[PDB]
Design a protein around this ligand. Sequence first.
Ligand code: HEM
Ligand code: HEM
Ligand SMILES: Cc1cc2nc3c(=O)[nH]c(=O)nc-3n(C[C@@H](O)[C@H](O)[C@@H](O)COP(=O)(O)O)c2cc1C
Ligand SMILES: Cc1cc2nc3c(=O)[nH]c(=O)nc-3n(C[C@@H](O)[C@H](O)[C@@H](O)COP(=O)(O)O)c2cc1C
Ligand SMILES: Cc1cc2nc3c(=O)[nH]c(=O)nc-3n(C[C@@H](O)[C@H](O)[C@@H](O)COP(=O)(O)O)c2cc1C
Ligand SMILES: Cc1cc2nc3c(=O)[nH]c(=O)nc-3n(C[C@@H](O)[C@H](O)[C@@H](O)COP(=O)(O)O)c2cc1C
Ligand SMILES: O=C(O)C(=O)Cc1ccccc1
Ligand SMILES: O=C(O)C(=O)Cc1ccccc1
Ligand SMILES: O=C(O)C(=O)Cc1ccccc1
Ligand SMILES: O=C(O)C(=O)Cc1ccccc1
Lengths: 480, 391, 480, 391
Amino acid sequence: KISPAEVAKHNKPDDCWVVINGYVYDLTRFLPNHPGGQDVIKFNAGKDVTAIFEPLHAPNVIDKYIAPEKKLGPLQGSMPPELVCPPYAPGETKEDIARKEQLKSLLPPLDNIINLYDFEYLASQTLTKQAWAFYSSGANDEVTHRENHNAYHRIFFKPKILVDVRKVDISTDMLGSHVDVPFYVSATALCKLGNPLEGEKDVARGCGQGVTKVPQMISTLASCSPEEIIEAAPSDKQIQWYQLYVNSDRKITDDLVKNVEKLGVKALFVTVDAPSLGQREKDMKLKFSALSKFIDPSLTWKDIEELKKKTKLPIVIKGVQRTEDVIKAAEIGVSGVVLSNHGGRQLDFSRAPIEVLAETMPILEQRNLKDKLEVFVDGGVRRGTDVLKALCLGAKGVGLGRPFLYANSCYGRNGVEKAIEILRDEIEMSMRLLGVTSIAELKPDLLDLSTLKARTVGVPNDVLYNEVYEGPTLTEFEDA
Amino acid sequence: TKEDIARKEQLKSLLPPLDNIINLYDFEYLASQTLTKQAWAFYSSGANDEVTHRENHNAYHRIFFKPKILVDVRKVDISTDMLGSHVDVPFYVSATALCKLGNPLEGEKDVARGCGQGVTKVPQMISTLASCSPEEIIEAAPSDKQIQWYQLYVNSDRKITDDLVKNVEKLGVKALFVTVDAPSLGQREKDMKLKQGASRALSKFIDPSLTWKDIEELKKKTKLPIVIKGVQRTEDVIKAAEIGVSGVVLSNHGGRQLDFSRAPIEVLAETMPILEQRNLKDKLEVFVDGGVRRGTDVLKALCLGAKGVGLGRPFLYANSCYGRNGVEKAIEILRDEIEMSMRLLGVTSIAELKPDLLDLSTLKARTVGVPNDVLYNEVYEGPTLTEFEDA
Amino acid sequence: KISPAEVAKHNKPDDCWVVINGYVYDLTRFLPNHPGGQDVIKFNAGKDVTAIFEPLHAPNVIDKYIAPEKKLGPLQGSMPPELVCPPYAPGETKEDIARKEQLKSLLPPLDNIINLYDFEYLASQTLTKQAWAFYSSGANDEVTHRENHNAYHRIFFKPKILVDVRKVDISTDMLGSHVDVPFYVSATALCKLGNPLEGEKDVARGCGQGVTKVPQMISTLASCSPEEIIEAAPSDKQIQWYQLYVNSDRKITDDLVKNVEKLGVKALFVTVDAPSLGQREKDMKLKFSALSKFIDPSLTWKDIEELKKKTKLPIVIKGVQRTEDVIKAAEIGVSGVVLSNHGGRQLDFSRAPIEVLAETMPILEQRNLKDKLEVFVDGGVRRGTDVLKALCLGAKGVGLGRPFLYANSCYGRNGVEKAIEILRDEIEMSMRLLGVTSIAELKPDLLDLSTLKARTVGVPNDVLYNEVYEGPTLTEFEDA
Amino acid sequence: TKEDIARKEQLKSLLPPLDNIINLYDFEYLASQTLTKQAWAFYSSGANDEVTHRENHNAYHRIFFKPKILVDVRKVDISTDMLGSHVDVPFYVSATALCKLGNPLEGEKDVARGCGQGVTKVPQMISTLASCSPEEIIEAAPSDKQIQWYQLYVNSDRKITDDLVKNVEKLGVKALFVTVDAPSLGQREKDMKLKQGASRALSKFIDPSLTWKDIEELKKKTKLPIVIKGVQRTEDVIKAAEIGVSGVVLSNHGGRQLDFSRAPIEVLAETMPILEQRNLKDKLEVFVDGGVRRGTDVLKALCLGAKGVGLGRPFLYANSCYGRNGVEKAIEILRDEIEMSMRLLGVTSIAELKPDLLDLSTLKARTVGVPNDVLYNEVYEGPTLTEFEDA
Ligand code: HEM
Ligand code: HEM
Ligand SMILES: Cc1cc2nc3c(=O)[nH]c(=O)nc-3n(C[C@@H](O)[C@H](O)[C@@H](O)COP(=O)(O)O)c2cc1C
Ligand SMILES: Cc1cc2nc3c(=O)[nH]c(=O)nc-3n(C[C@@H](O)[C@H](O)[C@@H](O)COP(=O)(O)O)c2cc1C
Ligand SMILES: Cc1cc2nc3c(=O)[nH]c(=O)nc-3n(C[C@@H](O)[C@H](O)[C@@H](O)COP(=O)(O)O)c2cc1C
Ligand SMILES: Cc1cc2nc3c(=O)[nH]c(=O)nc-3n(C[C@@H](O)[C@H](O)[C@@H](O)COP(=O)(O)O)c2cc1C
Ligand SMILES: O=C(O)C(=O)Cc1ccccc1
Ligand SMILES: O=C(O)C(=O)Cc1ccccc1
Ligand SMILES: O=C(O)C(=O)Cc1ccccc1
Ligand SMILES: O=C(O)C(=O)Cc1ccccc1
């Protein structure tokens, strides 16, 4: 027993007591190391914070990261009614229902989705403002995020013709496993914000339920536990990869890694591009209407060598942003590198991964390192021809984060299957048209790289000249 | 969708007189306002995102002219010789599937009549999937002098093709264009949106198995000159040369087959030097199409080497609002822009269109800009013009 | 006497009789050679066309270009009331007065004009649709016309600092005359459309009335005669230059040239860039709601040599569009060349004259021709820094056509003086700031030419990606 | 213009709490909604057309980063040494004439208090045309530790200047910035529009006669370190080096003096190699300003060689809506973007910002595009997204 007004006593920034599902916790040393930032816990401190908590955390977390002697005994009965926190939906009004009228069956039938951009549109409408902000933002005014997609558009194709492209096969192998498709679902934190009942379990299900099965990378900061997500996988032939942030308390990482090896995950993607979390202003603005110990900021190349000794899964460094570190990764002998800038949510004038890919692969060949490092690419990928562009430049496989978060959010596991289908078909269709019948035949010679560097900022222009100019017009109908 | 009231009132006597149609885009604006959705999506589409479809046109805007002045230009001559025959103008009507969608009554018979009713006889390429029989169409042609060509998909039941070839040859068509850029229907989502896995796009009519050997054999089975339609890289121009065909139409289907496919004019610019260095240029006729909507686009195309240039959609939507007379006028319009521009470049014969009339120095300034800085812009206010007195 | 219904008899395309100020004319052989195109005369043929005629033609024209035996005797009395043509204002409704309410004193006081773009704005509002169309159009969808101005914007500056720029002097000399300013008014056909009472006489007056006097180039197709325009010039120190189209009947040119030498004009600009008139669709569209003998299309370099023999004024070829013809002009030994594309009203993908200027001047130096040809530039020039850019590249002097047509149209002679003032001041002001004190010191080394060639056409982009993307927003006021 | 009701209601208690100001543009959006027209035109202007004014900022967008990963970055340090003194952060407040237009009550005294009230002490450059006396301002400074500099126009009555120098030196200012890019007030038509021939722009305060010799003499007449403010080409950097001054602020006044003046970052990128090749780099401090509105712009500037970067307008409009506290927060905001970015580039000291952290390969892709093809575009319709069911 712990008398509830004695609990509430400690409603302070520093020496914060809070109630989650009956038990009481001291969230004082904890507060500043919280993943999203201490803010949320501060504002709602000294209350029963259970509605904020439950629909949003991997069940395992308190037991896994809070000190045991901070897990304080139970709250006597309950909390005085305005102290049980209503669910977190900042900025949302009674809106929750117009977005649900929108959702309720007004969502077009899944057969009518023609592409990955339809899920986005549908998801910007029916998703909650916290979830839209969180899923869609980029760091800091967002030029690396949009850049990630536009850079694909600086590459055209050189199609071969009168080649018999009757059967086309797009399977490939990634990290020593034969995979059905050359792309994967990249780790995404908090999928229960968009798909509250199932979250990551439904992406596990859509990736392995159909005839095309796709690799799933699970996030260290996922709303579900890995053991739930791997259980929910419907096919023994589907693949799962685990993404790791290494903690300032290295034993916590140590136990996380031995636990996901045993659970069956096939590779470790260590995310190195986020020492400090990136400023995402669309979320910040909503919370009005960077270091912490969870992601240790002192991780160094010596830590990945010691991490190899502790594990038998191939290690992939996720977040490399220049050729110098792709070579460094090849020298410490790790299994592959994901050239990624974290969806343009971290350092904001970072380059487009396809542009770094282009720069790198000629160097790995000059240095005869090309066959000893698998290079993946993500960010910005939205059409099967964007996947073909990265694969012709020699990316081993391509990842997507947001397209799967919005298919899963709007249509759960069948949205994720429908997106896998949409893109498998775009790749295959665009491979006939490009004259090739297998991933192995996708080579740089099918691309025009000549204006890969046309990244222009135009001179500001001329509001008066253009305000007065008047363009030619079309023929007017006699009436209209 | 009940719009048929609006549309039948839009064409019927609200369409401006043919004499008020200044340019090939006017036809497109009026066709876009009157055709049935199903027709507009089929005619105006592109392969998903349509960036090669817009790029096709816009690469013309990367090429600037280098006009000669004080050159006598009272008399200019735009006739040329494409594929043995000698045609009136340097451009043609390209094959547009199912013309009866816009022109229910006469379909592609009306394009035939427009290509030969007036003064100028413009070549017509007949689609294997025409919604009128080759017979109907050839037979509709107004002149012994208008020349007609056949584009052919080769069918998987090859004897269908062998019948079809030998019968069109009977009907006196003057050449064969084997379209080869479509082993699979590109996703034209505009249609889809209104309307087998990645195989709905595969078809029985068009055979996915086609290969240079099939063209080699098709040479040896016909007398007509054969032109591969759909080449998209220099290597295939040089192969169409080594297997001995007549022409190559540098094309990508109107940006409705692969979507980051280069602009044909950008590929011409590069292939033609190679044909000169490999001495095989005089062998091959190289046609170009996609995006030509103005006389000056036609001329950049001829200055670079193209023997003749084709046009799909302008003719298709001229036909759809004004039938053969519309087709006839679009021919006049483009003939006058080509005449007027030559006289403004200081040239008089199509043979005089060479490259040195062209500023090609920014042909590769195909650029994607870096993302607009939304907030700098949201707070920035520009200058303002003067204001009239209110009173 | 010629009985008026006998007149009207011949109301036909071909065998067109028409009445202008009482006398009758046979405008049959004439019709197809008319400058604007036979259309206007056809439509209104066989009537009393005097209101179309009088407010729009140089008084001298009938007597000067019509065959004398085509000048038929007088119309008996008059024309049946609907056959006296109301004034040409195609597309104009009763509109003539809202544009005059606009004009009537609602036109801002001339002291409030800050720049050349204000006259344009004011002129697009109060000008008549025929005159707006005619003044503002370019040939054929208009990329060379807008290009002419934007190309200036591909050149930046390299200012010198801590230079004593107390007194700055901007006079220069052009075609052997010392001129107050480095720019001139370029020939413009029909100025009475915009300034009906005075037309070109008011530009003659504004160029020479003030303390800064500017060269006036008079047009062979001007609403006023040269003898009226030279009489109206208020200063004996102002300069006038004559622009010539040579006719298919070379004696007509022959007499035009000897007449303007005697009238006092100081140079002959022969316009060679218009064998055929350019398609200007904004006018064509209004006339619904190319060769002719007036401008001989067979003019050849041999005709400019024979024209030199006949004249003592310096000859300037106006309309050169490549370096090869600038050298040809230097070889036939003519006095200068105006690199111009006729305001982007003739061949429409022609280059920007500043860009050809840049290309040419290094060649005239390699070929030691630079001091023996004066090169002028026009088209697109709107700010004094655009004039400085052409002068640092070595243009001898810069011309403007539309800025003077819209100052004269809105404010007559004082608009033309105010524009001369506006630009004299922009040049002078921007010459202090650029560290130089005379035109002779304007040299290429003050410019950055490194992105002179950045003429880009971007890849079409991505309507779906951008339709769904949502940008970061600014802080909302508590209310607004 | 009676708006004063609207504006006094706009600031008074509709301005968001300082704690809700995410970035330096927020200040600009709120100042643009509340200042008097006369103030907004004076603060936010540019020399006619304002293309260098927008270009100043946008050239930052031509430079991309090359981050290092797996570099220990728990502890990063952004203090640097500008002009003998050792400052907290690598950036300063630049001289903004007449701060009392936005901040009537305290003018530039409030910027002094904002630059030293909080934790970080940011340098302040005082305008010779400040609307508060040097005395007032210096005296308002909260710390022995905040450093203050004086920018000086030299007056035509040079003894006024000689008095002014010797008295500011008395008041302990730590250096002199002689602004030299303004022998004549650029035409800021925004002001003009609301408000001698090409000589209204000439003034008595600023002397048009200034010349390197005057700087040479001014060296020999003061002890403070002198920085020429307004250099715009490498040659003048190298001359400021040969006449022995402390720094050069690569500047063009905020794009309100010559209007096609290059972007300072574009000129830094070019001058710094030259200073290395001519061995005189360690001699000169090179500051940069114009357009910096984000921490990453500051860092591109430091990676290229700049010793410190200044900012006019952000501080001026932070001061105008929130006075010294606004000035204090804009300092915090930029300090956190600079810290956060270094930790994301894998660097820890300002000395570690070198150039190899920069993708400078498209620094000269300052491009003007060719004219938008109005009609192709007017008739072109793009794809469309899916639609919710209506019911
Ligand atoms: C008992 C200690 C806590 C731990 C160990 C913890 C841990 C985490 C972790 C690891 C994440 C992201 C992934 C996941 O959910 O597993 C997260 C996110 C978050 N936590 Fe906690 N949390 C704790 C307490 C709380 C409390 C008491 C609240 C309520 C104020 C809360 C609210 C949130 C929210 C709302 C986010 C999402 C951030 C965003 O809005 O973008 N957490 N937490
Ligand atoms: C008597 C024989 C005629 C001659 C020699 C002649 C000559 C010219 C010339 C040289 C110009 C341009 C410069 C100038 O006005 O001097 C012009 C323009 C024009 N003329 Fe005539 N003209 C003749 C008869 C007519 C008649 C009968 C009409 C009435 C239908 C007419 C209507 C016009 C119009 C409206 C234009 C301006 C074109 C435009 O709208 O852009 N002209 N004419
Ligand atoms: C909501 C969201 C959360 C993400 N969370 C993680 C994460 O938990 N761990 C990680 O290593 N990367 C994360 N990513 C980024 C990567 O998986 C990946 O680089 C990706 O999202 C690339 O961007 P795309 O969305 O443009 O494909 C996240 C991205 C988004 C959009
Ligand atoms: C409605 C439509 C149908 C087409 N059908 C065919 C066809 O039957 N066979 C073929 O070879 N090309 C077909 N094309 C494309 C070519 O004739 C040609 O590439 C042409 O459309 C060029 O593009 P443009 O219309 O932009 O000039 C078709 C094009 C359109 C727009
Ligand atoms: C209404 C108008 C009429 C023109 N008439 C002539 C003309 O009579 N003769 C000539 O040689 N050039 C003529 N010009 C063009 C040239 O004087 C000149 O190249 C010029 O107008 C350049 O364009 P700007 O208006 O951009 O300065 C005309 C241009 C306009 C806009
Ligand atoms: C309102 C305003 C007034 C200015 N007054 C001066 C001044 O008194 N003296 C000076 O050297 N610079 C002056 N500047 C410009 C510089 O301090 C500096 O170049 C700065 O404005 C840089 O541009 P930014 O504000 O875009 O960073 C002023 C700038 C502004 C915007
Ligand atoms: O990985 C990311 O992109 C995240 O956003 C990290 C995170 C996870 C959960 C809450 C806030 C931030
Ligand atoms: O060749 C084309 O581009 C066509 O669109 C062919 C076609 C015709 C009719 C239905 C489907 C495809
Ligand atoms: O010189 C031009 O630009 C003209 O427009 C020629 C002209 C003159 C008078 C009427 C029509 C065309
Ligand atoms: O230096 C500047 O940029 C200024 O604007 C100086 C100034 C101050 C007050 C009135 C006019 C000019």
